[PDB]
Structures are given as structure tokens and as C-alpha cells.
Amino acid sequence: IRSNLQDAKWLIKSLESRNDTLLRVSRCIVEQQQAFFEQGEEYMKPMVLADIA
Amino acid sequence: MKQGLQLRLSQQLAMTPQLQQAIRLLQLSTLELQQELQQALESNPLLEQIDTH
Amino acid sequence: EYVFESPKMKEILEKIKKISCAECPVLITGESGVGKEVVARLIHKLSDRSKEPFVALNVASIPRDIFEAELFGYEKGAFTGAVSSKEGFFELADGGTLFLDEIGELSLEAQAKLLRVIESGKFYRLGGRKEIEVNVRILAATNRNIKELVKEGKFREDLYYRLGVIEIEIPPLRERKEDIIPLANHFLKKFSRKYAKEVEGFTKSAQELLLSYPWYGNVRELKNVIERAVLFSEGKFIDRGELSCL
Amino acid sequence: EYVFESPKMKEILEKIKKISCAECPVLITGESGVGKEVVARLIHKLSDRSKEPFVALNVASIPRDIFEAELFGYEKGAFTGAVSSKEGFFELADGGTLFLDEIGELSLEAQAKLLRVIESGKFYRLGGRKEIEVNVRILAATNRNIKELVKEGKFREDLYYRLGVIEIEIPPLRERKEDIIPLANHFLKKFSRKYAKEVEGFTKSAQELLLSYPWYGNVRELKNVIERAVLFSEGKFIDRGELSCLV
Amino acid sequence: EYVFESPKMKEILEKIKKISCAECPVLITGESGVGKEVVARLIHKLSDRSKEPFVALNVASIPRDIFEAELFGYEKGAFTGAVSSKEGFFELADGGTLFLDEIGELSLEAQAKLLRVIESGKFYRLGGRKEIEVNVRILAATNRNIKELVKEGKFREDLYYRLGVIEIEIPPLRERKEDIIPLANHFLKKFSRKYAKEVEGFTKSAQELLLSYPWYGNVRELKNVIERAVLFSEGKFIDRGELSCLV
Amino acid sequence: EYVFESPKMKEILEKIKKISCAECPVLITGESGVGKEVVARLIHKLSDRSKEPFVALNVASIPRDIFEAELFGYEKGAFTGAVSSKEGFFELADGGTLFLDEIGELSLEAQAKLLRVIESGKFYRLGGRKEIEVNVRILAATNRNIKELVKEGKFREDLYYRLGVIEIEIPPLRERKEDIIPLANHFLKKFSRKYAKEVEGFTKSAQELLLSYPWYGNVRELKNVIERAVLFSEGKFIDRGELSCLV
Amino acid sequence: EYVFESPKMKEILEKIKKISCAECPVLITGESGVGKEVVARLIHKLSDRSKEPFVALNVASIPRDIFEAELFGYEKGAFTGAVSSKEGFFELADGGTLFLDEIGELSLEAQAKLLRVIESGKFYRLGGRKEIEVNVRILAATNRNIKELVKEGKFREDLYYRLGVIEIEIPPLRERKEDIIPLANHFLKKFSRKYAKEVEGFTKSAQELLLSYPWYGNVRELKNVIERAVLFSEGKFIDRGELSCLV
Amino acid sequence: EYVFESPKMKEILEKIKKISCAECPVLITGESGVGKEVVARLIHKLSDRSKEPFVALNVASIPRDIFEAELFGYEKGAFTGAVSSKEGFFELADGGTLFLDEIGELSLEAQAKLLRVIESGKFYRLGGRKEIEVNVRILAATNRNIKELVKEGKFREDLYYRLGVIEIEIPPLRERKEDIIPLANHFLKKFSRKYAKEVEGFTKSAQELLLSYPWYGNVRELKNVIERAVLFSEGKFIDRGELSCLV
Numbered sequence A: 001i002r003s004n005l006q007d008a009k010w011l012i013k014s015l016e017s018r019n020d021t022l023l024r025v026s027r028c029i030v031e032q033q034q035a036f037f038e039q040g041e042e043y044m045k046p047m048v049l050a051d052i053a
Numbered sequence B: 001m002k003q004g005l006q007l008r009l010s011q012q013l014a015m016t017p018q019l020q021q022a023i024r025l026l027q028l029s030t031l032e033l034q035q036e037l038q039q040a041l042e043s044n045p046l047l048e049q050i051d052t053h
Numbered sequence C: 001e002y003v004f005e006s007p008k009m010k011e012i013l014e015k016i017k018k019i020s021c022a023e024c025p026v027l028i029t030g031e032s033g034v035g036k037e038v039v040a041r042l043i044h045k046l047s048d049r050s051k052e053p054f055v056a057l058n059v060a061s062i063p064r065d066i067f068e069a070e071l072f073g074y075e076k077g078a079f080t081g082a083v084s085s086k087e088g089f090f091e092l093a094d095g096g097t098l099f100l101d102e103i104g105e106l107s108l109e110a111q112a113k114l115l116r117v118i119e120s121g122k123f124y125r126l127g128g129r130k131e132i133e134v135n136v137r138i139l140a141a142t143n144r145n146i147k148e149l150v151k152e153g154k155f156r157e158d159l160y161y162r163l164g165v166i167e168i169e170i171p172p173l174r175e176r177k178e179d180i181i182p183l184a185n186h187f188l189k190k191f192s193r194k195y196a197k198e199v200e201g202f203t204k205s206a207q208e209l210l211l212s213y214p215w216y217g218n219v220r221e222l223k224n225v226i227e228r229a230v231l232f233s234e235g236k237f238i239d240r241g242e243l244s245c246l
Numbered sequence D, E, F, G, H: 001e002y003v004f005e006s007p008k009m010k011e012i013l014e015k016i017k018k019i020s021c022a023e024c025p026v027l028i029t030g031e032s033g034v035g036k037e038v039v040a041r042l043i044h045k046l047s048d049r050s051k052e053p054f055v056a057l058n059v060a061s062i063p064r065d066i067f068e069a070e071l072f073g074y075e076k077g078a079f080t081g082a083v084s085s086k087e088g089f090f091e092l093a094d095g096g097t098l099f100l101d102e103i104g105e106l107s108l109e110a111q112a113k114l115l116r117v118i119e120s121g122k123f124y125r126l127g128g129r130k131e132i133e134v135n136v137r138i139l140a141a142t143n144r145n146i147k148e149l150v151k152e153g154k155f156r157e158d159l160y161y162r163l164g165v166i167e168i169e170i171p172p173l174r175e176r177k178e179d180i181i182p183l184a185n186h187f188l189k190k191f192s193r194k195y196a197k198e199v200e201g202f203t204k205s206a207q208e209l210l211l212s213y214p215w216y217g218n219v220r221e222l223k224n225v226i227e228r229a230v231l232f233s234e235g236k237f238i239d240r241g242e243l244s245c246l247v
């Protein structure tokens, strides 16, 4: 019971961390490309993984 | 001075990696993540998912 | 599926059957290619340990400095690099059969390490303080002459009497002349089926030629010759020409 | 359970009974299969430590690079990979006896790690700064001739005198003619009971054949011969023809 | 592309064609420079494993003490310094071909380790308790008379019959005088293209000198001579003077 | 508790009493079983630091790979597995005496690590960055001719002159003819009290045989012979027939 | 910088400049001191790899037990001691030229370990499972007649045919009767420039002694003697007395 | 206080005064107990860096597997168990002097690692990234013949020629006979006051043997002899009879 409980806790923590990371990265991406959502394309900015990282 | 396979008591400085665990969950999409969660639920008796039945 | 037609090779089969109720170690001797592995596996099959593991170990392929670690195992912290406990081969073959193939190529230093495990079955793991007891039947096979080696002084005397409770010696193929033709037919059928050929027998000259060659590799050499003959065969009967390799 | 009938094997039993109260190390010598371990366990059983551990150790199967760790143990942090304190065979056998089997196979560099522990009984664990004292009785068995090796130079002189306080030598079976027939009958009864056969005894010709064979494996070889004879028997009396392996 | 013109070479080629449907071990013998590796690679190409690995291994450059670890592999805690599991060469070439080059230099102690693997195909790693089964075809090459070594006693008899299921012997260039001029022309064209010279062929006297010479290095020596002649040539034809290395 | 009736042992005792005030290292040489450890402990007891630790080490039982850690200590984090700081045998014996037993069995590479601690007494730990100074008297005992070892090149010359400031050699028991009778009686009494026997002394013939026999184990062999005589004795006096068969 | 004056030296220079476009292995044979290493470095300079490393290795001086590890390198965890990866000489000289000094002194067993690498150029690092491919030009130097050595059976025939594509010989000073004076003058003026000496040239008397005195160390001993004479010089001109003092 | 009363030693002292100002590594040479430590400490004392730290080190006491970690330091997390960041010896002695006793015991890898920092002058910590300058004055000493070491190959030629900028070789005491008498009295006054003895001088006969005995231990052996003579002799003067046994 104890081993399975600790494994369950670890899995739940991993899921929470994954969701938080996804939210942070998506919010940063949206913040970087702020003129796209107001005027569509022709206003994209050139960005790579290094900028978000 | 020699190249052999031996068992001995030595004093050494050891390096080791610490990354690989829980990183596979980031690349998976939502559907594959749910499938893996179901597979984890099957084997762990202490994990449950919210139901409305 | 095996061939036992010679008078010498049927007394051996009867003796193998008669020792089915025993658990004493067995020592098998002969030349190369006589069928020591066949006899060992037949001994294992016709006993009460039929469903138990059969661990075949080439004792000349284990490094000198990790012999004890391989044979007995070790506990955690025994040496630098022992991160977890690991069992040996005597625990792996527990309840079954351990076949120490080619025991004659073991150095005198390595012969003194398995001197107490054969008779008692009790030992200590490397870094372990509790004593482990196992139930393993030991078969050994060699192409040397262990008695002559002991007389010379390059084989330990205390190991020969621990191993040689039952001794079986397999005669060379050049003296089991009643088995040459059945073995030839068996191998011919096998190889003709495997390679999808049309050969189904030997001529009279080929049979007379197979009954006089002094087979040095014995059954293995006979098998190789039959395989070569089948691969290069053209017609439906193997003539004397195809057996010029003799 | 054991057979002691010959006159030479009764003075050995009397000596064993005489040294019951002692604690000095014992050295046992003799050919292969004469009964060295039988004598060692009999010595242990007939002493005041009869309810204490009997640690039988084959000194030929201990690697030379970890030898000191096996006999003396170590403490946590002694080396890389040492995560917990572990005891040795000298501390495991405290209060009982330690039986060094085949002591003649020990290398010269491995014989120098024992000199201070055979006599004094005090040592330090690997990485330990506290002295440890144990009470262990040391029995040693070998089939070599240590007196010859010491003069030759393959055995240390200062270890032979530490180990060799009481020396017991067991004569070969070919010089124990009064033991052959009782041992043969004892083995026959044991193996006939184990294999559920219907064998009862030997024939006079077989007995005469047994008393003339110059046994080289001694009691172990006799035991193997009797087991073979029992396994392949059909009648009630074993005949000279069945013992054809001796000739 | 390679040149096979002598009747013996064509017979060897036909044998290679015939044995293309089998997976038996092959043993190649000859002198130095006859083309043993060419034959081995041709056998690999014409077989069913043409797209599979061809692991060529020089068995004389493997240290004696780590011979087992190179061919079988080891687990994580096999010995001090072992950090991770690693495969051997019998598991790296699974499903393909293993070419043991210069097998005649293997010592008997090293030869004893290759007995069961060649026939059975199953083994245990160093420190592994699970039996690994592989499917590898064995080609072996040597320039020493293996039969003479076995008769003398320098080569194990248990390995010759395991390896020598099919045996191919390549004749020396001294017995392939129908194969010399095409090889000379091939090498001449190759080196003229490589070094951008202007030579085109040999004179009649040069051809006679080439054909009359008892080559001891065989094709390798012929190639070296042709390369030197091309490098030091100045004229349109390689006359008898440029071939002054030959005696 | 000890017998020093022989004139040579009297002179050695006088020399021991003469150097009580000094602190220079002492080197003790002799055969096996002559009493080197007795002399070392007497030297420690007669000195001014007699109430301080007497750390006795067997330098043949310290592993080669951790010689520096067991002799100087280490700081935490010095290597993988060094979870806490430890002291060495030089700091454990600080203010007292360090005895090195069987120093002739020390490898040539391990003798270079003692060059600066013996002379000056200052060293660094493993991973430590501050100098540690200790005051330790050093005694070394060996049963080999150390000068011959230096001449033959198996012992470092720069270490012999650091150790052998004062050299004491103990004559063998073959030359201490005056000590044979007392050392026997003493031992006799001791054993006659340990096993509760009725033995009271030797006959004149037994004393003559004791004096005649050339002892090869010296006092240790004398102890063994007397203990064997006492164990099997049945009577008030020990006769020639018992120790004669013992020797 | 180097001085080539003898007609044989000019012929060797022409040969070197002619084979500048080649990549074949080169063999050099001659007595010690003739300048084989200078010839090899000149060949490297004029080749297409003038901007690439020139690795020089003395194979005879490599210890046997590690001979492979120096040449091929090893992977991590290959054996007890392979804490980190390493690269061998064949991988250091990738794209450059590898010079093998004293190739004639190589053991008969070691030569068989270099058979494939010289020809194919591919190898496996000890403990590695991927094939390493390099492009290295092989220059070799020997002090003995290699053909006679092979006929003696002391040298591998296969290695000789792999190395000997283009072979060069350098006569000693006993045949080079014309370079002695220019070499002596060049050495004298170079040492005068180095030490800022007053020396300006040799007298007529001293010149004859150099031709009279036979040379065994050849250019090396000539340079050493001239440098020592320069160190002994105290005037602007040197007479025969200073030179005759050494010999 | 030290004794310098020999022209060969007085000129060495003058060279010390002419070298102490320089900032280049120095290499001392001599036999055992010639005064290398004295020379190094005098060099440090007479220089402007006298107030700066003087770190003496024994390179044979540094374990191999941690050698560089002890000599250059490491940062946090460099290896498992690294609980803190520790500086090396090059950073502990910054602006002062680093003495490396017995420089002949370094392995080839250690020599290369030391030579890298000696030449370049900068190094990186084991787990660090920033670079550190040396600002270290390096002194080395040994008793082995460095020329024989480099000729054999145990010592790197580059390291020796880099350290060979300044060389000081103390002659053996057998060549400094005029210094024998002043040394002994210097010891005689030191020990006599230390042990409260009333000995004040030697006899004329005693001094004759001092100048006639070859001193293999040089100064250390003479000091040992004087200490023994002071400790044992109890007269006003030391006579040749007392020294007869010692010498």
C-alpha cells in the first residue's frame, strides 16, 4: 500500500508540473506574438526556441 | 600499465546523469497522455479517476 | 530422434536408464564429436528433473578475476561497483542440472574454488554472511583423460573423486561401425529436407567408402561431410565422386 | 554414526577427548578423503563451544583484492561503494570455531594478513579507529605437508608455529585395514535404504577383493564404489563380478 | 570490380554461387595477398544477408584479459569500473556476418572461449543470468595451414571441425598466370586515372618480365609494383626499364 | 612477567632503560618468536609517555588503494562515499607510540608515503588544506635483515636511515642457553594453573633434552611444546618420553 | 635549413619532390644518424598535408601490456581504470602523417596487431561498438635490412608488403665524403650565431681531421663534437688542436 | 642555524643568493640527506616572498584517482559527494612558494597535467569554468638520477627541460670532508644540551675515524651516529672506542 501510494503521488505531481509548464510556455508565446492576434498575418514576428527558452 | 577486469576497493570521483524521468510526458499529446494514464490506473490499485456514474 | 544402434551404444543407454533414480554427479569422457552433449541432455531428460532448468556453462569462458563473483554471486557493497545484490549460477540452476562443459581446461587455481560446493552445496556470497544451500545435480564432460591428468599432476586429485561417482566413456565413431550408415541416412534426410533437394540415398560404392574412413571428428565430421555432399549434389543418388573429400 | 575401529584411529579419538578443555589452534593433515572434516566437526562437538557457530571457510575462494574486507569487515565510508558497516568472518564466528579448509593454498602475501589475529585476537576494521577483540578457536585442515613447505619456502615459518600447536595426522585407508569392512557395510546399508533396493551384504570373494585394493581416494572412493555397486545390483549379495571396477 | 580469369578462380566463383543458399561457416585459406577478403566480401554480397552488417574483426588486436568482454559484453555491475551495459561483437552482428580475420594467431586459451558460441549460438554476458541467442554467420580467414597446425598440436581440434564446414583454398598467383596481365592492366588504368599520368600499357618484353616473375606477395606485390611504375613513369608506355624493381 | 637471565638480554634491557628519555624511532630485528613485541611494549612502558596510546599496526593488512586514507584521514567530500571526516592512525596515536609490525612486507611504492611524516611529523589530510602536526614516537619491528634488503634494492635507502636511528637485535634462543630452563618452568607453571594439572617440574633428562634441542620457533615453539606436555601429562613430573615424542 | 650537397642527396631530393603527389606508405632504411627523420619531415613538408599534424611515434618504446590502448584508444568503462575516454595516435594524426621510428625492433606479436589498420584504415576503440575511419599517411624508418630480416623469419611478411610501396635508402657519412665540410661549416656558423662567439671559421689544418676521422654516429655525433668544440673555442679561428682533443 | 664551511658549499650558497630573487622554477639534486630541504628553505627565506606562504608537498602521498582534484581544486557538483567547493594547492600558495618533494614519483599523466599548467600558466578547476592564474614559485627536489629517468622514459623530456632552467646539485658528504668536523660538533652541542649530557667535545683519536668512514646516509647518518654516541656515552669526551661499534 505504501509503495503504491508514493507512486501515485509522484504521478500526480508529474501531471501537475506538465500542465504548469504548458501554461507558462503558451502564455509566453502569446505575449511574444501580440500583434498577430490583433491584425492577423503579415505581422508575425520571427522567433525561435531560444527566445522562449 | 595493465588492462584487466578486476574486483577491488578503490576511491573514485563519480559522475552520473539525473534526467530522463517524467520528461516523456511533455511530448505526448492529450489522447496519448490519457491512454498512458489509463495504463497506470490499471496497475496501481491506489489511483482513481473522477467519474459521474 | 537420435541414433543408437551399435552394441556399445545401447549398453550406455541402458546404464543411463538405470541411474534415473540417482542424484550423483556424472563424468562423461571421450573424443571430440562422439556425442557427450547428447548423452548429457539425455541424462537430464530421463530423470526426475525433466522440467527443471538445465544450465550449460563453458568453464573456460569465465575471466580469472571474477570467477567467484560469477559462480557464487555478491551482495551490495562487496566491492567498488557492486550497486545491487546479484545471484550466481548455482542459485540460477537451483533445483535443476548444471553442466560444466569442458572441465579439463580449468587451471589449478580455479579448480580449488569449487571444491566444497560440489559435495555440500553450501557456500557464501561475496560480501554475504548467511550461508546458502542449493540442490543441484552436476554433469561434467571432457575430451581429455582425467585419470591420466591426475596421475601427471596437472589436475587436482580431490576434485576427480568428487566428480567421478558415475563415469561414462563414449567410444569413437571408427569403432561403432553399426552406426555409420544409419547416421549417414539420418543426416542425408535432414539436410535434403532443409535445403529442398532431391537426394534420397547413397550408392553401394558410397556406402562402402563411408564404412572404412577413420573419422577423426567422428559424428560432427560425418555431419559436415553429408552437408557438403547434399549442397553440391546434382542427381538423386550420391555417388562415390561426391565423396572425394574423404 | 562414524566408524573408528583400527588401532591407529582410536588414539586419535583419545587425543580428541583429551583436548576437550583446551582452546589452542588445531592443525589437521592427511591424504584426500581420510576424514579431516569429520575429525574437525567431532572436535567441535566434544568441547564447551558445542552450542556455538562452526564457520567453515574455504580460503581458496576469497579474492585477493578484497581479502581484508572479508575477514575483518569495514565501516561506512571506508571506500567508494561502502554504504553500511559490515562484519567479517572473525566477528561472525565469535564464541565459536573458525575452520580454515585447505589452508595450504593461501598465497604468501595473503598469509601475512593473519599473523596478528591468530594469536592476539585483536584487529581494526577497514576504516575503523576502535580495536575489536574476539574469542575464536581456530581449526585448520590441509592435505599438503606443511613441514616440508616451510623448509622449501612456500609457507611462512611464523604462521606455521602460530597455527601448529596441536597437530593431528590421519593415516591412509590402505593402512587402516580394520576399517574397510565396517565402512563398506555401513555404506551398503545407507545406500540400500536410500535407493529402496534389496541388497543385504557382500560375498566372501568380494570382501577379499575389497581388502586388497590400494585405495587412492580413501573413504570417498570406497563410498563411490559402494554406491555404484548398489545402484547396479539385482540380487541380495554383491559378487566379485560386480566389483569389476577395482581390477 | 574484381578480375577472375584463371580456371581455378572460376571454379571457386561457382562454388561461391552454389553455397549462396546455405548459412554454414566458411574457412578461407591461402597465401598473403591472394584475395581472401575479396572472396569473403563476395560471399557476403551474394548471400541472403546482403543488406545486413558485415562485422570484420581482427582477433589478434584484442587484449587477452578483456577478450570475453569484447565478444560477449557485460552488465552494469560485472566488475570495478563497469558503469553501463554494453553489447559484444556477437550481438552487434546479429542477423548478419562476422568475419574473423587472421584466426591462426589465436592462442589456445583464447581458442577455448569460442567453442560453444560457434555451434549453439547462445551465451551469457559477463554478469548476466539470461541466455542470449543470436543468428550470425561465421566467415574465417587465415594464411596458415590449419590442418598442419592441428596435426602438430598448435590448433584446437574442437574448433577446426566447427569452423571448417566449407573450406576454400585460393591458389597463389604463381599458379594463375592466366590472371596476371588483366590484373596488371586493371591496376595500371586505376593508378593512371588517380595520378593523372599518360601511360597506357606495357611493352611485350615488359609483359614477359611480369609473367615470368615468381610473385611472393601475390596481388598486393603486383599492385605495389604497378603503382611505383606509374609514379616513376615519364613515357607513353611502361617498358622493361621502368620495371627495374623486379630481378 | 618476563625472563631476561641471559647476559645478552640483560644488555638489551640495560639499553632499553638507557633510552627512556629519548623519542627517536627504534628499529627491532631478530628471528621469529624471539620477543620483538615484548621488547617494544617494554620500551613503551619504561618511557615517559607510558600512559599514552600504544597503537599497533600490521602494515601488511592495509589495502594498497586506501593506504593514504587509513594513515592520514580525510575530509568530508574528498571522494565519493566520504560522507563524514575521519582521522588517521597518526592522529589516533598522537602523543603516544605507533608500532609497525612486519614492516619488511611493505611494497616499494607504499614506502614513499612515509618519508615526510616520520622525519618532521607534518602532513595534510585528503581534501584538507591546513597542516597537521603530531608528536608520535615510532617503533618498527621486522624479522628480516633490513640492511640486506636495502643492499638488494627491495627496501628504500632513504627510509632505512629515517627508521633505524637506534637498532636493537635480539639473539635467537639457540644462543640464549641460560634462558631455556627458566622460560620452560615459567610456562609450565602458567599452564599448570590454566588446565588445573598436578605437574610440578621436569626430570633431569627432560631438562637435558630441552637444552640439547635446537629451537627453530624460539620461545613460541617452547610455549607450544610445554603446552602439549602439560595437556597430555598424567603424573607429578614430566618425563623425557613425553617431550621427546613432542620434539 | 637542411643541407643537401652529395649527388645521392640530390637524387633523394628529386625522388621526394617527384612523389609529393602520392599518398602511399613510405619505408626508409639506413644506419643511425644519416637523417631518416629529416627526410621524413621533408617529405611531409612537400606533400599535400603541409598544414596538418606530423605525429612521430617510437613503437619499440611502448609497453607491451598497453600497446593497444596507446594506438586505438579506449572507451569509458572498458576496463578497471578507464574512467574517461581517450584517443589513440591513429586518431590524433587524422589528416596528417604518422611516422614510425625503430619499426624493425617491433616484437613479432605486436606487428600482427597493425595488419588491418595500415591497409584499410578502420578500427574499433577498446570498448567501442562503432567503426572509426581515418586517413593517415604512413612513414616508417628502420635500421636494418628489412628483406633479410624477413628472410630470417623475424619480421612479418604481410606487414613488409603493406609498408614497402616506396622504399628509400640513405648512405652513411663514410660514403658521403663531400657533405662533411659544408655540414661542419654550417654547424660552426650556427653555433657562433647562437652563442655570439668570436669564431669565424675553421683553419686548413682542422679540415683534414674531419675527413681522416671515421664517423659512426654520423651527423648526430658530428654535430655534438662540433658544438663541444665551439664551447671550447676562445678565438676567432680554430686550429686542429681543439678538434683533435676529443678524438 | 645551518653549517656552510666548505668552498663547494660556499659557492652553492652564493648561487642561492644570486638565484633567490628570480621567479623561475628551481630543481635541486643530490643523494639522500645532502641538504635539499635546507637549500629550498634558504631559497624561500632569502627571497622577497619570505612572508608569503611556503607549502611543502609530498607528491607520492597524493592518490592517483584524485590527483588533479587535490592539486587544482574542484567546484560544487563536480562529482558525486562534492558538498562544497575547495581550492587546490596552487591557490592555497598564491604569491609564495610551492615545494614538490621527490618529483620523480609522478606518473606520466601527472607529469603531463603539471607541465600543462607550468607552461601555459593558467588552469581551470575540476568543475569550474573561470580561469585562474598561477603566481606560484615552483621548487622541486629528488634523489633519483633525472637523466637516467628521462633516458629510460619514466620522466618526460619536456617537463625536465622546462624545470631545468636552474639546477643546484649538492655534492655528497664523501666529497666534503672539510665539512665533516664542523657538522659533528654542531650536532654534539645540540644533543648534549637536549639530553642533559655533559659531553663537550671529541677526542683526537675519535675524529680520525669520522673522516675515514664513507657516509652512505650523508648528513642524516652522521646526525644519527652523533645522537647514539651522546645518548650512550657517559664520559666527559667521546672516544674512538665508543664510535668503533657505531662506525
Ligand SMILES: Nc1ncnc2c1ncn2[C@@H]1O[C@H](COP(=O)(O)OP(=O)(O)OP(=O)(O)O)[C@@H](O)[C@H]1O
Binding pocket: C001, C002, C003, C004, C031, C032, C033, C034, C035, C036, C037, C038, C039, C101, C102, C141, C219, C220, C223, E158
Ligand atoms: N547418436 C547421435 N545421433 C544423432 N546425432 C548425433 C549423435 N551423436 C552425436 N550427434 C551429433 O554430433 C554433433 C556433435 O555432438 P556433440 O556436440 O555432442 O559432441 P562433443 O564434441 O562431445 O560435444 P561438446 O564439445 O560440445 O561438449 C551434434 O550436432 C550432435 O547432434
Ligand SMILES: Nc1ncnc2c1ncn2[C@@H]1O[C@H](COP(=O)(O)OP(=O)(O)OP(=O)(O)O)[C@@H](O)[C@H]1O
Binding pocket: C158, D001, D002, D003, D004, D031, D032, D033, D034, D035, D036, D037, D038, D039, D101, D102, D141, D183, D219, D220, D223
Ligand atoms: N570414519 C568414517 N566413518 C564414516 N564415514 C567416513 C569416515 N571417515 C570419512 N568418512 C566419509 O568420507 C567422506 C569424505 O570425508 P571428508 O570430507 O572428511 O574428506 P577430506 O577430503 O579430508 O575433507 P575436506 O577436503 O572437506 O577438508 C565423507 O563423505 C565422510 O562421510
Ligand SMILES: Nc1ncnc2c1ncn2[C@@H]1O[C@H](COP(=O)(O)OP(=O)(O)OP(=O)(O)O)[C@@H](O)[C@H]1O
Binding pocket: E001, E002, E003, E004, E031, E032, E033, E034, E035, E036, E037, E038, E142, E143, E219, E220, E223, G158
Ligand atoms: N581478383 C582481384 N581483383 C582485383 N583486386 C584484387 C583481386 N584479388 C585481390 N585484389 C586486391 O589485392 C589486395 C590485397 O588483397 P587482400 O586484401 O584480399 O589480401 P589478403 O588475402 O587478405 O592478405 P593477407 O593474408 O596478407 O591479409 C586488395 O587491395 C584487393 O583489392
Ligand SMILES: Nc1ncnc2c1ncn2[C@@H]1O[C@H](COP(=O)(O)OP(=O)(O)OP(=O)(O)O)[C@@H](O)[C@H]1O
Binding pocket: D158, F001, F002, F003, F004, F031, F032, F033, F034, F035, F036, F037, F038, F101, F102, F141, F183, F219, F220, F223
Ligand atoms: N622473556 C620472555 N618471557 C616470557 N615470554 C616471552 C619472553 N620473550 C618472549 N616471550 C614469548 O614469546 C612469544 C612469541 O611472541 P612474540 O610476539 O614475542 O614473537 P615475535 O615473533 O618476535 O613477534 P612479532 O612477529 O609478532 O612482532 C610470546 O607469546 C611471548 O609471551
Ligand SMILES: Nc1ncnc2c1ncn2[C@@H]1O[C@H](COP(=O)(O)OP(=O)(O)OP(=O)(O)O)[C@@H](O)[C@H]1O
Binding pocket: G001, G002, G003, G004, G031, G032, G033, G034, G035, G036, G037, G038, G101, G219, G220, G223
Ligand atoms: N642533411 C642534413 N642536413 C642538415 N642537418 C642534418 C642532415 N642530416 C641530419 N641532420 C641533423 O641530424 C640531427 C640528428 O639526426 P636525425 O635524428 O634527424 O636522424 P636519424 O639519426 O636518422 O634519426 P633518429 O634519431 O630519429 O633515429 C638532426 O637534428 C638534423 O638536424
Ligand SMILES: Nc1ncnc2c1ncn2[C@@H]1O[C@H](COP(=O)(O)OP(=O)(O)OP(=O)(O)O)[C@@H](O)[C@H]1O
Binding pocket: F115, F158, H001, H002, H003, H004, H030, H031, H032, H033, H034, H035, H036, H037, H038, H142, H143, H183, H219, H220, H223
Ligand atoms: N648544511 C647543513 N648544516 C647542518 N645540518 C644540515 C645541513 N644540511 C642538512 N642538514 C641536516 O639534514 C637533516 C635533514 O636532511 P634533509 O631533509 O636535508 O635531507 P634530504 O636530502 O632532503 O633527504 P631525502 O632526499 O632522502 O628525502 C636535518 O637534521 C639537518 O640538520
Ligand SMILES: [Mg+2]
Binding pocket: E036, E037, E101
Ligand atoms: Mg587480409
Ligand SMILES: [Mg+2]
Binding pocket: H036, H037, H101, H141
Ligand atoms: Mg627530502
